[PDB]
């Protein structure tokens, strides 16, 4: 299909939910065509942030980023936020025409909040539209409870790029099972 | 599980899109069941009233209609509305679930996957904008869902 009909899937991992204090610690990007066919995997980058920020994280955040092995990789990182944005923006410019492709993901409103503040040039390459798999998830649970039960459970967190894969798989499941 | 499957619909008008500088001009809220039937209509406030009182009016309304932390925020391009709400109405957002139901996601899937249905798919107040967003979602349920 047309490059203007491609989707830009992102997944971010952050120190918390507070847009004033918290920072982006991991990011991944993936391109699919309009029908969710896999076109190209983008960078998977672990971004350096201070130790003070990593220790002030919520008890849920501290354990979940520890078992996935992220906090260790954040502490050994040489990638700055600015360097990561340059990598992500370069990749999407090579894959999509400017300001025409949507952001896609799971509860991707949360990621957009952090991308709007900390990666505004990357966000200018994207159109205003959002494709949020979690809106489809909520409608599946209500309107198609039988199909919702058969969907696979999500795997344990590894890296942001694997989380995007699970989000794509989830929306493909919805298309395959609850769309006309 | 019928109560946890209800939806908290909102629509807001702001002075712009910057969270640090812009403010909430208008807000409306209403509750639908899981099948989109309107169970109760809330107030359509011009912010005339204050933001903290508007939050008390809306928090009182959703506390007598849905259980805390189980029902999502629902709307059309509600990602921008959720940003202004998390900041300026954090006690209201504490009553809702972390996920949201955004009709603009369904519109976009309709546009791509159902171009024919998309071509024949279907405001002065913010409450009227919610009513039209529900009719838009009901159209997608009927025309593109199995």
Swiss-Prot record, chain B:
This is Oligoribonuclease, mitochondrial. Its EC number is 3.1.15.-. Changing residue 98 to A: Loss of 3'-to-5'exoribonuclease activity. One of its GO terms (molecular function) is magnesium ion binding. The modification Phosphotyrosine is found at residue 56. The active site is at 124. The keyword Transport does not apply. Changing residue 113 to A: Disruption of homodimerization and loss of 3'-to-5'exoribonuclease activity. The record marks 17, 98 as: Important for dinucleotide binding. It is an enzyme of class 3 (hydrolase). The modification N6-acetyllysine is found at residue 107. Keywords: Acetylation, Cytoplasm, Exonuclease, Hydrolase, Magnesium, Manganese, Metal-binding, Mitochondrion, Nuclease, Nucleus, Phosphoprotein, Transit peptide.
């Amino acid at each position: 299909g047309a490059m203007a009909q491609r989707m830009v899937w992102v997944d971010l991992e952050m120190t918390g939910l507070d847009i004033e204090k918290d920072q982006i610690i991991e990011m991944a990007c993936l391109i699919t065509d309009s029908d969710l066919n896999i076109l190209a995997e983008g960078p998977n980058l672990i971004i350096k942030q201070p130790d003070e920020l990593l220790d002030s994280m919520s008890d849920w955040c501290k354990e979940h980023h520890g078992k996935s092995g992220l906090t260790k990789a954040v502490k050994e990182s040489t990638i700055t936020l600015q360097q990561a944005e340059y990598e992500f923006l370069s990749f999407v410019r090579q894959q999509t025409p400017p300001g025409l492709c949507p952001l896609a993901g799971n509860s991707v409103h949360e990621d957009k909040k952090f991308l709007d503040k900390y990666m505004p040039q990357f966000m200018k390459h994207l159109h205003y539209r959002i494709i949020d798999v979690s809106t489809v998830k909520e409608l599946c649970r209500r309107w198609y409870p039988e199909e919702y039960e058969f969907a696979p459970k999500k795997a344990a967190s590894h890296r942001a790029l694997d989380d995007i894969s699970e989000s794509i798989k989830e929306l493909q499941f919805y298309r395959n099972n609850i769309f006309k």
